[PDB]
């Protein structure tokens, strides 16, 4: 039985994919897993989440080892982007990770490292341990990241200022609009960190991705066979998705109990992930749009911010004492007493999304969220905010046909309550709504097939374990 | 009942479309047809093809009259392109065609002339007979040909040296790379012959094309309604395609018998049309790529040439006595004894492509070939060589999504056996392969709809017969 160590980047958005991957391997592929989870400075949430997961392993086939964050406040400023921040954190923690692996009683045979932990190459190489990246999102975004080194040299000026879509060899073309956050401003350090990340991928022995063949056959084939791309990559790709939490059934969840009282596929779940937050004006538009729709809803709400759309990613612990009602339109909660259920800070998305009464998901198009929705056969309103979400949203709406979206990107134009209402009703009242759901259910099934024995993703994991064992010479 | 005469240009590429058109009109539109087929000096292929078609007409509603080629060796030289050659041939045969039509017991009411026979205007006009061109290819190429008169005056220097794509009003933009052969070298006489051809179209009473509305709705609309284009065209367009041979089921075809022994959609058919030939180096790369793919194949091979990619166009009868094995890598045939079947010179392409075991087509993107594939629901590897094929290949790969292709044009960069293998496996092993096939089958159905009663193409033929009868005042 192999020992594999998986390094998790800071934040729940990265920690969860890693935990899920480790669980997947331990359960379905009979592997010992050690998750090296890079912690954030301010979340007893993340830490106690880890304590609850360590408590559940009687079988110790999975073990969790936290990596304490190094203080980088002296390295950053008010304009430093989360991309850059995570990269820096990882880099500054590399010595600690070295000492950890060195101090391990029994070494890992392999090391799989989250998207931001690509800077840990030297440690794996030094110890002579098989090294892979986990890209817990789309192959499209991976292809963009890799080929970005080429774009950097072939394109002058900002990508956002281009007239023609970016053509990644063998992939679907990307409009300036839908680019990932690093490519928005090339003058920003996160951009160069990103081009660098794109290159760093290729230095690993392989790349796991949380997608599958059915979902992205063309992009995956491009990574494997497109000659321009392969000139850059030259290492195996492992579509192993869609990996997500299996639903833990809680009898004491009042949200679930409200949902039990609802009709099948009658509820819209509304959430922008752990990181997402809306502006005051947009959150107001949203409150009223939901009201106007007269559809039933469950809405995870956070205090609004008119700054960065992911500014709640590291700052969810910042104790804003204000009640929900204070940053909602007055009496909204009084008027939607029957119609909806407003949830503070976080909820068990998965358990919610698996509930029969849920029939719609207004999402930021975070890949974890997306996967969770699709695997439960839920159609979506695409509301991209940060990271790669615009790109995923383009994929979801245009190509896959499992989501609808505003005429202009939410991050570009205010989505008014009239449009919000209209979208919500399309999803929840109309036949367009039905057919979106059917497609999402088809994707649900294709995903179930990929993960089930002999599926592309099951097999891709077997190929991975092969790759690892062939390297243990 | 109308009498229509259809003039065919030299070579199988042109003769077949004309035969098919005549058959289509005679059968489905109850018309008397007389096909005036301009012959090549050396093809028992062309002649026996004619014998097979003459044998089928007990009803003589279609009759075939050969036009013997005139000797033009004194008019050409070693640098004279096939474009120019065909134009000259036609021109020099014009008197003979005149005497033929003049000597006809009962005149044709109309005259439809192949792409290269646009120089027969004077004969039709003189006799006062309705005159049309048949453009047995894409509307995109037609639009380019017509608008080329404008490009000539608006662009200085070579098209191949332009930075921006050529924009034909109302159509998809064309990269320098994908231009038709005449536009490659403007200093060449074939270029001016081509600009001239583009203009000549517009002097006819109408233009038939072997495409349909579903396939090229926007280009067709542009021809009809774009003001810039209409300033040049001002005559009706008739999308009547996709017209091709109906499959004649042949007793002692050994290729068909090999195919019978194969699995469904397990065979790659490989062919570069009547004209196409590969360089020695490329044909070697190809042999090995097919070998490496470990996919089953049927491959129509011709002796290689490092010169003109269509240099087998007028030499298709010339029995080069060299065995296949002499211009293939040694023992290739010995090693692929089980895996493939290498065919010399010609093959019932239509009957092969309709065979259940055929699941892939590596093609030069000749429009007849393309149509044959699409109408049988076969996905393609786009390998453009000559004429307009690059442009068709762009259309097939980028827009339609029914073909895959090399990173760089085959005629630009050597396609190595690694890439060949990869492409072949994408098509024949992967899910990308599956979905390309489904799209090709959707096109198959849309085509079936166009041709069936009341379809755009059926109707376009009815519109044509209307046009002819309104001109018989
Ligand atoms: O109320 C919430 C908000 C978020 N999440 C989870 O937290 C992550 C969202 O974080 P992020 O904004 O990075 O989006 P992602 O790309 O992870 O979906 C996903 O795993 C969601 O399942 C959740 O379970 N409940
Ligand atoms: O081995 C071969 C090669 C070509 N063809 C036929 O010859 C015609 C030539 O059309 P193509 O698309 O190849 O155009 P070209 O490039 O020859 O002008 C088509 O009907 C093909 O089916 C055939 O029957 N067998």
Descriptors:
Rossmann fold; 17 helices; 43% helix; 13 strands; seven-stranded parallel β-sheet; binds uridine-5'-diphosphate; alpha/beta; homodimer
* Percent in strands of chain A: 5-15%
Alpha-carbon Rg of chain A, integer: 22 Å
Oligomer: homodimer
- What can be said about the biggest beta sheet of chain A? 7 strands, parallel
Largest interface: A-B, 13 and 13 residues
**In the CATH hierarchy, what is the class of the largest domain in chain A?**
Alpha Beta
List the total number of helices of chain A. Answer: 17
Can you name the CATH architecture of the largest domain in chain A? 3-Layer(aba) Sandwich
> How many structural domains are formed by the residues of chain A?
2
Our measurement of the CA-to-CA distance between the termini of chain A, rounded to an integer number of angstroms, reads 15 Å
> What is the CATH topology of the largest domain in chain A?
Rossmann fold
What is the structural class of chain A? alpha/beta
Which molecules other than protein and nucleic acid are bound?
uridine-5'-diphosphate
| Number of beta strands of chain A | 13
Keywords (chains A, B): Glycosyltransferase, Nucleotide-binding, Transferase
Organism (chains A, B): Nicotiana benthamiana
GO molecular function (chains A, B): nucleotide binding; UDP-glycosyltransferase activity
Family (chains A, B): Belongs to the UDP-glycosyltransferase family.
